[PDB]
Design a protein around this ligand. Structure first.
Ligand code: ZN
Length: 223
RNA sequence: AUUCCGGUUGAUCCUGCCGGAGGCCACUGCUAUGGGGGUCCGACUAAGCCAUGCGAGUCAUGGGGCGCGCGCGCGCACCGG
């Protein structure tokens, strides 16, 4: 379809982009757990073509900030945006501009560059299935004054959390969760970053080879 | 649904309080077709005052006796329980 449409008019600037364009890197999971740097959004546009669909591109927050000069007030726009494959890959970005379209575009680019993969499972006392509809164990996240704690829930319990957390977890591929919070949750940037870090910290919990089949743990895409 | 949103600045992050948004009880405005079930209706102020009528009686196989009809049968009150 549009693979030859996105790959033909792109000239790589970095070495990872060249590796991807030649064809030696072929799956999304081969770019993560090395010390690789990602400085091109076309890498992710090639390896995850689904992040380009407009239904996977939630725009979260738009703010208008002012800088004083003796002439007048200089206005700037700040846009916090979210991107994600709905099967375990998420990204969060912030973009500034002298107008709104420039800021939105820069936010989506920086969201594509900040892509992470997460782990999923069941882990609940009340469901005990082995299907990756939630997170497999409770996790913590912090940002500024905001603290977030996520806990696994049973099937059909849909996303008991604020709306920013709702959208981020929906772009993550998670469907059931309980939550607790502390701090200035009315500041959208800090709440969003704390939930992002909570989702990241699923990779920081040590597990034994017997837990992967008890909780149905899946790393990245499922099936 | 183990949930958040608005408000102190030229703009920002915090603390902290006020408000919204849910449910139950009492008074109340506008409006109102029909059935069923139920442990609903002068409790909050004055456990303030009350006109009238009803809310506790029964036994004639405990006793004597009066009346009405043919010793018997019906009825009334009295003593007694
Ligand atoms: Zn489950």
């Amino acid at each position: 379809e549009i693979a030859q449409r996105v790959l033909e008019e792109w000239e790589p600037k970095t070495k990872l982009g060249r590796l991807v364009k030649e064809g030696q890197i072929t799956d999304i999971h081969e770019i993560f757990r090395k010390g690789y740097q990602i400085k091109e959004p076309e890498i992710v546009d090639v390896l995850l073509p689904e992040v380009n669909l407009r239904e996977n591109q939630e725009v979260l927050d738009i703010a208008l900030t002012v800088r004083m000069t003796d002439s007048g007030r200089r206005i700037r726009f700040r846009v916090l945006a979210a991107v994600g494959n709905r099967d375990g890959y998420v990204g969060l970005g912030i973009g500034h501009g002298r107008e709104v379209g420039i800021a939105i575009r820069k936010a989506i680019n920086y969201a594509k560059m900040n892509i992470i993969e997460i782990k999923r499972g069941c882990g609940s006392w009340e469901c005990r299935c082995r299907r990756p509809h939630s997170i497999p164990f409770a996790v913590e996240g912090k940002e500024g004054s905001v603290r977030v704690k996520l806990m696994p829930g049973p099937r059909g319990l849909g996303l008991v959390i604020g709306d920013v957390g709702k959208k981020i977890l929906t772009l993550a591929g998670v469907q059931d969760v309980w939550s607790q919070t502390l701090g200035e949750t009315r500041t959208t940037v800090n709440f969003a970053k704390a939930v992002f870090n909570a989702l990241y910290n699923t990779n920081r919990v040590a597990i034994k080879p017997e837990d992967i089949e008890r909780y149905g743990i899946v790393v990245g895409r499922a099936m």
